[PDB]
RNA sequence: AGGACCGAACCGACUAAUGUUGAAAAAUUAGCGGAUGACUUGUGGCUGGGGGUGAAAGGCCAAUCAAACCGGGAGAUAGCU
RNA sequence: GCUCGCCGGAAGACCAAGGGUUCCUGUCCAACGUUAAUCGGGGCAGGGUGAGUCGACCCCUAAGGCGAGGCCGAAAGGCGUAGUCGAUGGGAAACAGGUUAAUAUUCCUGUACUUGGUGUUACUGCGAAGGGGGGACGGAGAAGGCUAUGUUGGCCGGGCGACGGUUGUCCCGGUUUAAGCGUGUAGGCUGGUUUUCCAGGCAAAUCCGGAAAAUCAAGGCUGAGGCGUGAUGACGAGGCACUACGGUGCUGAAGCAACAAAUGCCCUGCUUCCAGGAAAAGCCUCUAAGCAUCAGGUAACAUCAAAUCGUACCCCAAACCGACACAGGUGGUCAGGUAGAGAAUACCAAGGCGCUUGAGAGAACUCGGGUGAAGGAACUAGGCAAAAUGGUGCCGUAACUUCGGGAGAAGGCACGCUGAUAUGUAGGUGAGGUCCCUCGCGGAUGGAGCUGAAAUCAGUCGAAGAUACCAGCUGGCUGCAACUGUUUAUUAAAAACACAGCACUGUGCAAACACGAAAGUGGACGUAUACGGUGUGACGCCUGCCCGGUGCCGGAAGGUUAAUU
RNA sequence: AAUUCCUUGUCGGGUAAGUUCCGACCUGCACGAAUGGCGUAAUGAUGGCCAGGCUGUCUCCACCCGAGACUCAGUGAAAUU
């Protein structure tokens, strides 16, 4: 049976990476708020 | 010609084509050709805004020129071409000076045939000139609605438009939906009909032949639950209420023109 | 020639048995339908929640859909247990 | 190590995606492995990924994204121009052999090729953010010519048989060699060459397009494969000396022909059809502004440069997606033998595996199968399930029908093996020889050799010859839907949805309509033979009466009637 | 009748026996003409019915071949309480 996740690393960073989130008020909110709670991994960039 | 396929298969039985060998058996002009993209009936939003546009077969846009603007210069058509975007043929037409266009495919024009634009161009079909020196009572087709923005009026297979009367700087005209229009007495009109007549006695068929078109089918309304359309819903086929749209409006006689912002172009609308 | 015929790949899911703390949160086995087309498939793209998309079942929208998910208003309110 | 069994259009081989050291070596067995474990994709340590030519990067663009100004919007922000990004597409070049425990078209040997920089020499009109050409494109079908590959013969080496025979028409193995360069063939496309002229290609143009003459027919382009060279090489079954029986030096014979033959190549071709089939750059040309004893351009030679990143390993799976070492899912490439129409199926080759608890016993019962006296649907909601039919050829085939069908209707007959016709026929393939020739990869004749159905006649074995796997049950009446299709991923596949066809109605283009506070976008680069909405649902015969109600479309006197005053 | 409550309507066909099926009848509870009427060849993993063939579906089960169940060694769950 085919699964929900079908990983693909140019869609990934596409949709969810540093770059995506910056581009955009909402998503760099995102990043603050993962900041402010310390997260070690801002992104899935790497 | 009007052939009816014979009823080799479920399929085949009620197809009925137009076969034309006229048309060049070739592929058109590349330097009058250009990309035309899909859209699926979406925007620039990405919304479907217009029902049942989908898939179909790969196009290439020709250039047509509807203006006629090359005045004083004879052409020869060279040849008729299937087009793909409209339901009339096309002709490549090649002018004195080494210049080659498409025009829109009058009724009686074959290979060889000269055509002309301008004020002094003769009176025969495939000419364009301004509806001043056009003879009242003539037949028309790829009328300019406005002076020197090419034709947008009769541009259909068989379609034309008849010059009524001339009063002054505007020309009665009776269009093909039946509506009297008038226009100034200066917008081109090229002589005759667009030559495709037997275009509306096709039979696509089958369900297929309309996806070629790109058409994606329609589904009623009456089977769409209420939350999907106004039809919708009933145990087993009820419909008791008056028919509407999607985003309920009437749809049998409710008239939507409102724009008034021309308001005297029009005589006689149309019935 | 064909939304033509028989039939593998491929795409489907009509019947039965098994399984039902399963090998598997829908599969296995034996049959079954389509199989040049309104076909199928890889990669990328677009449409966002009273909105999308829907050959229309209230189907589908990340194992969740008669209004997704996450956080917040929030210790909603509960004459009921 | 010897047997046995299983896969073999994979359960083999090579990749992308994804993973990220799982790769190799040594060492360890606590935990992990559904058991033990000395073993492991486990622990620990070390080692391992070598590129001008492969890929990425890079140049070019598709859908689409972003978007200087700009337009629009309470703010956030939306759209979009010039531009700039974006492969799943276009764009220069390397092959064979050898080699590591683990990498190789990357290292080594041999032999090649591509694009740039610089310098010398010779001859010269060079120049683009512009013009033109090219790149550049669909589906289906049909052969013809080929190769991959296979079979047989010949050749070379070895063998003479655990049990009757086996020096022969016998047995086993091998019989391999690339890119590049030269030749330009089967075949495809197109008439060339010179001169003059021109409202076109935003200006220009010798280029493209167009026009008018003169002269010749052979000009050019494209093109698989073959052949030659590459190659006095490499490889090569086996030997000969070391040989820790783990392997290394040296040597190493034959290395041909015929036939068959692709879904691969010629072919981005040809034929045909309608639903009419990307873009841009590289590349080839044209000139403008400009520079011309310069600069630049072309050719030859020499020299230099071609960076950077990826390269291990799994990749239909124990390493990816499924919480698992999970009967699931996962795109591309390669495609041997016998039988066969076949990539079905059976048995096999290369290669890879026996699926990480076993050992006994031979109760009920359950699961998956085999057979069955007599009967033969009496079972049951229902022939559910099972059984049965099953191939090729010939004969034969009803009602009805839209004349296509129904139809493989139904039904009947023949199928093995051996010999002969014919020491292998019809057919296919085609050597030598001869002749012709614009003397070449040519044409005609020619038939050796090879390959090879089908049929008839006769004989013959068995219970059974389409013997296995494989492989339609058939017919009669009737409801519904015309049909092929679509649907409740995960209890409903249907009479439901679509459908071609039909009708009503809206829509004159800045269209109706739809998404949007708006700009704008779709509709459509369409224009009433068009487009939207609604109902009906092939086709045939038809579709009657009613406008009081509700809606819709018109109308005009009169009544009533908002803000405002 | 995919529509008929009364109802297994009545008659005929098929069966030894037919609330189903087929053909007529018309007393249409409560068909009816594009939310179409009536026909219709072909088509259908569609509904109903009848035949030939076929059979362990059944009368009525018997035996056999394998995988479990049972015993031994190793590992070692669950719902519930």
Known sequence: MKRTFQPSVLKRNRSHGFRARMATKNGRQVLARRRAKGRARLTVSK | ??????????????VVKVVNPELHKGKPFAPLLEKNSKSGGRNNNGRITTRHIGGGHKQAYRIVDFKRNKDGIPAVVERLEYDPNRSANIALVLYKDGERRYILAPKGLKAG???????????????????????????????????????????????????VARDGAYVTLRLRSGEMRKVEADCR?????????????????????????????????????????????????????????????????????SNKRTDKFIVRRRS
Not at chain 2, 1 to 14: D, I
Not at chain 2, 142 to 152: I, R, S, Y
Not at chain 2, 227 to 245: A, I, L, S
Request: aromatic share 2%.
């Open chain 2, 113 to 163: 045939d000269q055509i002309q634009s301008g004020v002094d161009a003769a009176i025969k079909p495939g000419n364009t000139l301004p509806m001043r020196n056009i003879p009242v009572g003539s037949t028309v087709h790829n009328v300019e609605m406005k002076p020197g923005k090419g034709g947008q009026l009769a541009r259909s297979a068989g379609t034309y438009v008849q010059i």
């Open chain 2, 189 to 257: 009109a090229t002589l005759g009909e667009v030559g495709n007549a037997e275009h509306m006695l096709r039979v696509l068929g089958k369900a297929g032949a309309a996806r070629w078109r790109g058409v994606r089918p329609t589904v009623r309304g009456t089977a769409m639950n209420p939350v999907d359309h106004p039809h919708g819903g009933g145990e087993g086929r009820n419909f008791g209420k008056h028919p509407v749209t999607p985003w309920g409006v009437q749809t049998k006689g409710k008239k939507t023109r």
């Open chain 2, 1 to 14: 010609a009007v052939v009816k396929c014979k009823p080799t298969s479920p399929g085949r039985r009620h």
